[PDB]
Amino acid sequence: APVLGILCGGGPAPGLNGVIAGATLYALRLGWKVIGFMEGFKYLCTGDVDVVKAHTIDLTYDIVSRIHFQGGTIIQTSRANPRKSPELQENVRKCLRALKVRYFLTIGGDDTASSAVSVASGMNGNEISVISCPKTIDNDLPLPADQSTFGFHTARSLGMEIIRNLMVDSKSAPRWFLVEAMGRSAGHLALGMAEASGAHLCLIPEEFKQDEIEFEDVVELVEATILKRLAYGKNYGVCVLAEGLVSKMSKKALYKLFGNREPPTDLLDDAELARSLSEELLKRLGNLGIRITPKKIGYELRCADPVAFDAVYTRELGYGAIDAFLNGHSAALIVRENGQVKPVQFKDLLDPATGRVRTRLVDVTSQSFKVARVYMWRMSKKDYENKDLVARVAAAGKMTPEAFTEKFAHLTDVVVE
Amino acid sequence: EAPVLGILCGGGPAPGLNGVIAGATLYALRLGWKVIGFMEGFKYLCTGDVDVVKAHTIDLTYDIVSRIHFQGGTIIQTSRANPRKSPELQENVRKCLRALKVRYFLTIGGDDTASSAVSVASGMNGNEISVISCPKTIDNDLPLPADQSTFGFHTARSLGMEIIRNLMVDSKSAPRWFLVEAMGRSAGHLALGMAEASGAHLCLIPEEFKQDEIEFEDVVELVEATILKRLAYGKNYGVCVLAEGLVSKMSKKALYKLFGNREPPTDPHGHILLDDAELARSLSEELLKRLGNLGIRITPKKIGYELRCADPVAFDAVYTRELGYGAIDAFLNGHSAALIVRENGQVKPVQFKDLLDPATGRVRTRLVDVTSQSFKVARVYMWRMSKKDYENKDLVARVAAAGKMTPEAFTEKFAHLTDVVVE
Amino acid sequence: EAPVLGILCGGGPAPGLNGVIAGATLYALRLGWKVIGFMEGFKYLCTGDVDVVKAHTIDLTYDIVSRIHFQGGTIIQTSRANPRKSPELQENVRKCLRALKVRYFLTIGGDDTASSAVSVASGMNGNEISVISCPKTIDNDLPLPADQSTFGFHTARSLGMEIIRNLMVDSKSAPRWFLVEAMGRSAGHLALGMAEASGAHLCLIPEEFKQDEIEFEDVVELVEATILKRLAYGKNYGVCVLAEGLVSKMSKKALYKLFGNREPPTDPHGHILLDDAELARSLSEELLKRLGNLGIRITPKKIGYELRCADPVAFDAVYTRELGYGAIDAFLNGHSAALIVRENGQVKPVQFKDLLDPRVRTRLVDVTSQSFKVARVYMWRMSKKDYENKDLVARVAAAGKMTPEAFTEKFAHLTDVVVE
Amino acid sequence: APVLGILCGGGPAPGLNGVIAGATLYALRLGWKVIGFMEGFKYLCTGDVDVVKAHTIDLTYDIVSRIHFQGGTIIQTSRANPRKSPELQENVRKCLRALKVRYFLTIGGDDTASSAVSVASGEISVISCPKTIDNDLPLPADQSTFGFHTARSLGMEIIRNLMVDSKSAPRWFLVEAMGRSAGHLALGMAEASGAHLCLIPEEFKQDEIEFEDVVELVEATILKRLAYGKNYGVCVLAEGLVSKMSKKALYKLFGNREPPTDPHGHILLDDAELARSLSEELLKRLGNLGIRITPKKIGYELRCADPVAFDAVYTRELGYGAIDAFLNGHSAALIVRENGQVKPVQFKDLLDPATGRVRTRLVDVTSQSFKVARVYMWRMSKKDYENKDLVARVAAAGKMTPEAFTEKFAHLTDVVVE
Numbered sequence A: 001a002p003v004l005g006i007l008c009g010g011g012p013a014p015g016l017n018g019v020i021a022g023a024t025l026y027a028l029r030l031g032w033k034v035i036g037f038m039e040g041f042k043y044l045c046t047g048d049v050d051v052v053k054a055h056t057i058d059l060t061y062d063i064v065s066r067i068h069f070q071g072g073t074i075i076q077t078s079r080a081n082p083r084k085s086p087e088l089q090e091n092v093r094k095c096l097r098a099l100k101v102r103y104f105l106t107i108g109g110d111d112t113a114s115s116a117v118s119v120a121s122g123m124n125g126n127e128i129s130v131i132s133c134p135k136t137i138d139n140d141l142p143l144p145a146d147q148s149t150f151g152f153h154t155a156r157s158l159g160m161e162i163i164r165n166l167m168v169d170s171k172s173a174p175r176w177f178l179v180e181a182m183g184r185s186a187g188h189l190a191l192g193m194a195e196a197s198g199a200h201l202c203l204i205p206e207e208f209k210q211d212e213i214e215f216e217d218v219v220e221l222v223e224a225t226i227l228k229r230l231a232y233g234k235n236y237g238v239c240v241l242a243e244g245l246v247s248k249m250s251k252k253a254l255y256k257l258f259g260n261r262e263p264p265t266d267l268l269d270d271a272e273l274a275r276s277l278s279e280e281l282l283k284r285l286g287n288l289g290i291r292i293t294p295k296k297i298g299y300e301l302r303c304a305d306p307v308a309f310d311a312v313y314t315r316e317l318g319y320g321a322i323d324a325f326l327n328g329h330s331a332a333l334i335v336r337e338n339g340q341v342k343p344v345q346f347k348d349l350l351d352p353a354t355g356r357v358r359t360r361l362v363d364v365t366s367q368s369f370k371v372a373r374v375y376m377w378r379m380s381k382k383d384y385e386n387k388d389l390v391a392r393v394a395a396a397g398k399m400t401p402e403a404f405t406e407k408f409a410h411l412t413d414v415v416v417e
Numbered sequence B: 001e002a003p004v005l006g007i008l009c010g011g012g013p014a015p016g017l018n019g020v021i022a023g024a025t026l027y028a029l030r031l032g033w034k035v036i037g038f039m040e041g042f043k044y045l046c047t048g049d050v051d052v053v054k055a056h057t058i059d060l061t062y063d064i065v066s067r068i069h070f071q072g073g074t075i076i077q078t079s080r081a082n083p084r085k086s087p088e089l090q091e092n093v094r095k096c097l098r099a100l101k102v103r104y105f106l107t108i109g110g111d112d113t114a115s116s117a118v119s120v121a122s123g124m125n126g127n128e129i130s131v132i133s134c135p136k137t138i139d140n141d142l143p144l145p146a147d148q149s150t151f152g153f154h155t156a157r158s159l160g161m162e163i164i165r166n167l168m169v170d171s172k173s174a175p176r177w178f179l180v181e182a183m184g185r186s187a188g189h190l191a192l193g194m195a196e197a198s199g200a201h202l203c204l205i206p207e208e209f210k211q212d213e214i215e216f217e218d219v220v221e222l223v224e225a226t227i228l229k230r231l232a233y234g235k236n237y238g239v240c241v242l243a244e245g246l247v248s249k250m251s252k253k254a255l256y257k258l259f260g261n262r263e264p265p266t267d268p269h270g271h272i273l274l275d276d277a278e279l280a281r282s283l284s285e286e287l288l289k290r291l292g293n294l295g296i297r298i299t300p301k302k303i304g305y306e307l308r309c310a311d312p313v314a315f316d317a318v319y320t321r322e323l324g325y326g327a328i329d330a331f332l333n334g335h336s337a338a339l340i341v342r343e344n345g346q347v348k349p350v351q352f353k354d355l356l357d358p359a360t361g362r363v364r365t366r367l368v369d370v371t372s373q374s375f376k377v378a379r380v381y382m383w384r385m386s387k388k389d390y391e392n393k394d395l396v397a398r399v400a401a402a403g404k405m406t407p408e409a410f411t412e413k414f415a416h417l418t419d420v421v422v423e
Numbered sequence C: 001e002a003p004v005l006g007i008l009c010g011g012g013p014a015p016g017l018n019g020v021i022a023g024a025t026l027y028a029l030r031l032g033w034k035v036i037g038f039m040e041g042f043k044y045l046c047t048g049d050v051d052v053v054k055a056h057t058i059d060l061t062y063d064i065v066s067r068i069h070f071q072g073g074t075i076i077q078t079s080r081a082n083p084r085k086s087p088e089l090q091e092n093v094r095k096c097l098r099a100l101k102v103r104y105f106l107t108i109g110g111d112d113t114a115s116s117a118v119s120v121a122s123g124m125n126g127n128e129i130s131v132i133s134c135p136k137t138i139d140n141d142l143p144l145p146a147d148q149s150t151f152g153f154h155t156a157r158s159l160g161m162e163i164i165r166n167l168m169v170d171s172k173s174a175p176r177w178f179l180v181e182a183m184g185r186s187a188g189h190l191a192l193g194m195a196e197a198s199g200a201h202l203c204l205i206p207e208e209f210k211q212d213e214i215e216f217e218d219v220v221e222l223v224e225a226t227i228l229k230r231l232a233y234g235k236n237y238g239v240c241v242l243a244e245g246l247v248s249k250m251s252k253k254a255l256y257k258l259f260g261n262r263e264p265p266t267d268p269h270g271h272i273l274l275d276d277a278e279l280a281r282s283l284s285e286e287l288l289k290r291l292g293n294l295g296i297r298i299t300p301k302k303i304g305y306e307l308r309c310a311d312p313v314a315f316d317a318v319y320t321r322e323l324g325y326g327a328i329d330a331f332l333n334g335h336s337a338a339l340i341v342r343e344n345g346q347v348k349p350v351q352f353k354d355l356l357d358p359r360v361r362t363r364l365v366d367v368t369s370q371s372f373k374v375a376r377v378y379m380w381r382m383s384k385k386d387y388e389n390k391d392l393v394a395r396v397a398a399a400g401k402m403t404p405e406a407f408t409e410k411f412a413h414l415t416d417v418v419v420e
Numbered sequence D: 001a002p003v004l005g006i007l008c009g010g011g012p013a014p015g016l017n018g019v020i021a022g023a024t025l026y027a028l029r030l031g032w033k034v035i036g037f038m039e040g041f042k043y044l045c046t047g048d049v050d051v052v053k054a055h056t057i058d059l060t061y062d063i064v065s066r067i068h069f070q071g072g073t074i075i076q077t078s079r080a081n082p083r084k085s086p087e088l089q090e091n092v093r094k095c096l097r098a099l100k101v102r103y104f105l106t107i108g109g110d111d112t113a114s115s116a117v118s119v120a121s122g123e124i125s126v127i128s129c130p131k132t133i134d135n136d137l138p139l140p141a142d143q144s145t146f147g148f149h150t151a152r153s154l155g156m157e158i159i160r161n162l163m164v165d166s167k168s169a170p171r172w173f174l175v176e177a178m179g180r181s182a183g184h185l186a187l188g189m190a191e192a193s194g195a196h197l198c199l200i201p202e203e204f205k206q207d208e209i210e211f212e213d214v215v216e217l218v219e220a221t222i223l224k225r226l227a228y229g230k231n232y233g234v235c236v237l238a239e240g241l242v243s244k245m246s247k248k249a250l251y252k253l254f255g256n257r258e259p260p261t262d263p264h265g266h267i268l269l270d271d272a273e274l275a276r277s278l279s280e281e282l283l284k285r286l287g288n289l290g291i292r293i294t295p296k297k298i299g300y301e302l303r304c305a306d307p308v309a310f311d312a313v314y315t316r317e318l319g320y321g322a323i324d325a326f327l328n329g330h331s332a333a334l335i336v337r338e339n340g341q342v343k344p345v346q347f348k349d350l351l352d353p354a355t356g357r358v359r360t361r362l363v364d365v366t367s368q369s370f371k372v373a374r375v376y377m378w379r380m381s382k383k384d385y386e387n388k389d390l391v392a393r394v395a396a397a398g399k400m401t402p403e404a405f406t407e408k409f410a411h412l413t414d415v416v417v418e
């Protein structure tokens, strides 16, 4: 009876347990023995056969038969990475061989799969075969457009519900919420939350023409939306911001981001973008009876119980991983393109630019992105050319139609219309 | 004056109806259109009385629709009253639409609603009114490119998943078997989706039965062998999800037995009233006679009326907003007698004649593809006796012993089930 | 060694069972006690074979229970097996408890579980073992001070409200009447709670019927009058919630009509089987004959088992944690054959004798309380004054397509059938 | 036809629509005409009766028959305080008389009720209802203000997700629960979700708190968890710890700077980030041990969640009791529920003599409920500090001697109640 070894690396995503139970349940039906390494590679890195034994468990039918309802991961996860030093990988090989592992499945992000292949490449193919199931809550893998990664549906739906309450609260007690969606990689999650909840505005790094952002431009994009809605008798709303704006700002923009101060280094995590915009917008707009409050959606999504779409999705990835093992595949990533859970070789998907896996961003030319824009509140190219509109909007700001055009009309060159 | 967009909903409600209404109305309002909404579908348009229709038409304004994307149901209600099979009724709808100066006419409903919409258009100048329909089914039975859902389906399946979740915890905490009947006889998409997501131990849908007709006995025994196999592993509990469509695939011998060894009730037109069937209840009643003495409890449970007006999940909120936008886009581009659908992430108008099945003159019905990879994966995790399973003497020994019968008795009673359903 | 604490669950599950288990276990481990849990209640303690019991007992360690307060149901499962009817079985239970050196025996369950625990205790020494039971009922029918809830009732009521909420939107979007049957015949706390919270138009609990036996005709007419009054205001839809206990209060003639003018079902021993009674289904078919010509659709809906194992809401999470703590404190203070309950914000042991009047005194809805009166105001119903309002009776009668004389003679007697 | 005028004051709480629907629907049956003032006292305080009439609506059956399902308020709310100045009450009296409203119903918390009393001194009866998610109105013991159950329940669900994440990917979450008046909400969320630590101002003995003590209280819990093999957890902090802090503590809290202040000299505690500051300090002290720490705010997403069944029933009965108090001629009272009965309680009985405004009900840290909640927390008790064996294990977890651990932490037993 061969041995299967599963582990999780990187941040958790809803439905992580779904993959573990999908692979384990099918493997047990074949008669395999399944084990799970706690906290990813953290203890395989030490190379101590008994420190590892104290941190691996039997993945039995009883353990996994009902985890498909539950978020997080029963075998935990960690960012521990054996790929960064020649000693660590050998410690991994020493423990896999000592554990008589035959099939090796990892569930994790771009940095987690690379560890799997590197440890595998220094091992005989007849003794160990490696498979990985890439995971990401930011929906940034290069699957065919409109196709989502597992966990993304759960994250977007819970985020919609959180913004729903902020939408009702912003109207009931007039204010503006600046909701910062966690995740600097792409803009899929911020735009999905905003469009589903009817958020009045969404800013993502992908909608900016210039290769760097200026702090003042982001202030004016939000300031224009607040002015236009105020011009229609509404002093409240919700604006959603992808954190990826941070990783695109310029050096000067980052300096203003931290309060006109030099930023720390080894550091965009310490950045507080929604909070910084709230302070600047309050100096400019507070006199108009406008309250602004930042709010961060984020960590609370990572271990939400999977929605039905991600339950089916992850189970089919678990079966697929075992199926790739049976069909002899190795060094491949389990993906579902066009409704087929097929093994895909990491070479065929690794974009040569960054070395890591190709990251699919939001297509702001697609119609889907255009539809989201129609239901937002923003001054378009045509809007600035409407004298009657510009008159009311500038009046709402207690500025003249002229000063308003000086300040804000340039924004049509910062963001794709 | 400004062009008038009239909106109605037909058929049974599904999550996201308001989302379609808000997408069409908000976009139209930005274009300066006047948006009105007829209450209860074609109900009053069929009368032909202009005043009555005015008494059941409301002005769809910004503040009314600005926040209904959060809410299930339809703020303009819905009806199934349809004028398609009445030349007089079709004219009556035309007279009321002309009276209200309706330039763009949008219907949100199922097959009957869309067919009625085009029939109203067959006798109207193509430059005075355009007709667009937005297909709606929680049953997911539209012939969209497979694996792509219809709006409302994701919401119904997710809520359906959470109900069965509580039934799975309850069935294990207090050992019991639940027969969950998923309302709707169109297809098995809802049953299989809820069962696969919730990890139910069995899902029976009409698509997997090879015979053109189904026998009540074969359904009893398919569930029975699943229960026995579970019993052979120390587990006297589980959940089985039956698609209601099994009833409409049964033979008349199965119907008489289903209705209590009696005569199926019928309306005053000669049609069997299948809504009065109690599939899940009848099968648990029979299954208790056979397996009850093995310390097995069985309980029916229906799901599906509570699903139809659940608040839409994010996938449906985005979906229906894009559909409502697409309806207005079709109006602008000049399309008419077209249905707004989303294929490959693109909302496009598709002519109604192009969706007809030439054999029936009816829009095609997409059922579960039981030869798909997805369905095979679902079956892998179900608890059932497969073909090669019946050939394992050790396994049939354990299962037969669980049922307090001999191995030869088990093969006699249950081995024919591999020829009843696709393996 | 260290004291052994055995825990089991008996009967129907309710939200928060895991809360009581976790509250008792976590505190017990803080005291150094060993904690064990019996799968499926007394089912295996009845067999007597100790090795079988060991195969169905688990060590309740810190990591087993530290996070089950989120989870509904019970990890140690439950069963209706009760050794209270066989000292052959009670001796078997005592035998396995002694083998496992159970110093403290905490059972969570209903009447059969509670009484079964004390009878086993009666045949043992008061120093070797001590027994405490935590009463459990999702029906809120324990005799606590008025308005104070049993654990799990909040969770069940809130989930039921959500289901009716979907039914209310559906009934209005696609005009229809839903007859929501709230399962449970013990009392009407669940039905009234769900209906009041959800804005349901009518609620019928057996507590409001003045007479001792209920007639099938009268129940039909109480729903009928509400539907007609709604029709008289342009509303041809609504939700009416029926407590399943209406079946248990019906007269012999009423039962005969309820099952379809056939002999009521019965078990092999001759006792009536009310579980086969589809109360909402029968009332829908009957009300369809009478009101179908008016354009009224009526569909039944059952809200039962999906409540039992819903995840506990915050009120019940705090509740059952305080209960579990109180059970350990009762063991420490030397209490035995006692029930752990909470009254006026304090968890405390309460001897069996305090609450018992055969099974425990069933607390029913107080239909004379101000709480029930307020619920009635927001219902749609023909009060005694409504029947005497000539103008109103004309509108309702016309909605039902009958003369005011016919309406008054048929429906006006209902003022003496249910509390005014 | 008598006129009922309804407004909402203060921050929203789930069930406001329940009160409005219960009061409006009953008043409709009595034949009353019902109206609603937008944004609460914002425009009744102005005295411009022309502006007031613009932002008023007629509360009809269609408007309110189904809002009992919905959180938020259909008539909005503001924090405007007519009790601030003598005519701030006068403008309200003038506008109310102009509209000829017989019955005036305010739906708000401690600040709103005091405003209602400031106007109830002159034809027009005034009744309030107990709105607050902070559970800090002086209702009978063990009896909650409406909206508190819903806010606690949704807060528990949010923390549950943070609990699964803190264990799946070992991390510590510092949850800051909104509300500076009392610790009810923070304690309810933490107890129900099984959070490892909770800190509320009610448990500190001295009336001024030091930043160092707050940091060390979390530090002791994190170290103790490490001693027992766990490098993760969740800690809930009532944000009212900032309002109990000393001037020196506030200086450290705002990054060793003078706290921001309003044009009147009072301190702007809204700009404070308690959880963020503690996280930064604790990461400096414990990151080497393998401890990751992350702050999270909860509370703006709680104010307008759809009410739970408890608040739906509660607000339906409170709204009924408001019309019943009006029907009985009562005035200058707040509707309360005790033993399942709604009754008016005069504002005079609820006023604290020193403040002059409605009395704030804090958590009773001497009660059994609080003691039990503490038993399930991970903390160092007075006895634990006297356990030489336990102290050695925690100190080793913190990479320090037992002597150093006792010097730094043992004094905490005099900082908070045991």
Ligand SMILES: Nc1ncnc2c1ncn2[C@@H]1O[C@H](COP(=O)(O)O)[C@@H](O)[C@H]1O
Pocket: A228, A232, A374, A375, A376, A377, A378, B029, B030, B031, B032, B062
């Ligand atoms: N940026 C915007 N996004 C969405 N709706 C808008 C926007 N600006 C105006 N509207 C609405 O579009 C409709 C027509 O606007 P108008 O033609 O300016 O009266 C009204 O309901 C406006 O409130």
Ligand SMILES: Nc1ncnc2c1ncn2[C@@H]1O[C@H](COP(=O)(O)O)[C@@H](O)[C@H]1O
Pocket: A028, A029, A030, A031, A061, B229, B233, B380, B381, B382, B383, B384, B385
């Ligand atoms: N019908 C079934 N569906 C899913 N899993 C099953 C089924 N029958 C057995 N198993 C499980 O498959 C694994 C291997 O089965 P066996 O080798 O027969 O013990 C065990 O975990 C069984 O419980």
Ligand SMILES: Nc1ncnc2c1ncn2[C@@H]1O[C@H](COP(=O)(O)O)[C@@H](O)[C@H]1O
Pocket: C229, C233, C377, C378, C379, C380, C381, C382, D028, D029, D030, D031, D061
């Ligand atoms: N049975 C009832 N329950 C609750 N509200 C009612 C009932 N009957 C009438 N109403 C409402 O009471 C108000 C006064 O009605 P009326 O007495 O007809 O003027 C209106 O909002 C009616 O819809």
Ligand SMILES: Nc1ncnc2c1ncn2[C@@H]1O[C@H](COP(=O)(O)O)[C@@H](O)[C@H]1O
Pocket: C029, C030, C031, C032, C062, D224, D228, D375, D376, D377, D378, D379, D380
């Ligand atoms: N401060 C605390 N709060 C809650 N549980 C604790 C605390 N300290 C220890 N425990 C647990 O209580 C039990 C007693 O452990 P010990 O004191 O080592 O015998 C073990 O399960 C510990 O993990």
Ligand SMILES: O=P(O)(O)OC[C@H]1O[C@H](O)[C@H](O)[C@@H]1O
Pocket: A197, A198, A199, A200, A201, A234, A237, A375, A376, A377, B026, B063, B065, B066, B067
């Ligand atoms: O806040 P309201 O004016 O009511 O509604 C604002 C709308 O604009 C937002 O993008 C959403 O699509 C909403 O429907």
Ligand SMILES: O=P(O)(O)OC[C@H]1O[C@H](O)[C@H](O)[C@@H]1O
Pocket: A064, A065, A066, A068, B198, B199, B200, B201, B202, B235, B238, B381, B382, B383
């Ligand atoms: O825990 P049990 O009820 O034994 O088994 C549950 C699993 O069996 C079912 O087919 C699903 O695949 C679940 O994952």
Ligand SMILES: O=P(O)(O)OC[C@H]1O[C@H](O)[C@H](O)[C@@H]1O
Pocket: C199, C200, C201, C202, C235, C238, C378, C379, C380, D021, D064, D065, D066, D068
């Ligand atoms: O909207 P409708 O169905 O007409 O009325 C709903 C109300 O009537 C019900 O008794 C409850 O009191 C609800 O508030």
Ligand SMILES: O=P(O)(O)OC[C@H]1O[C@H](O)[C@H](O)[C@@H]1O
Pocket: C026, C063, C065, C066, C067, C069, D194, D195, D196, D197, D230, D233, D376, D377, D378
């Ligand atoms: O699973 P762990 O995080 O170790 O412990 C969680 C428990 O510890 C906390 O104080 C609560 O009482 C929880 O029940």
Ligand SMILES: [Mg+2]
Pocket: D010, D109, D110, D111, D181
């Ligand atoms: Mg206050």
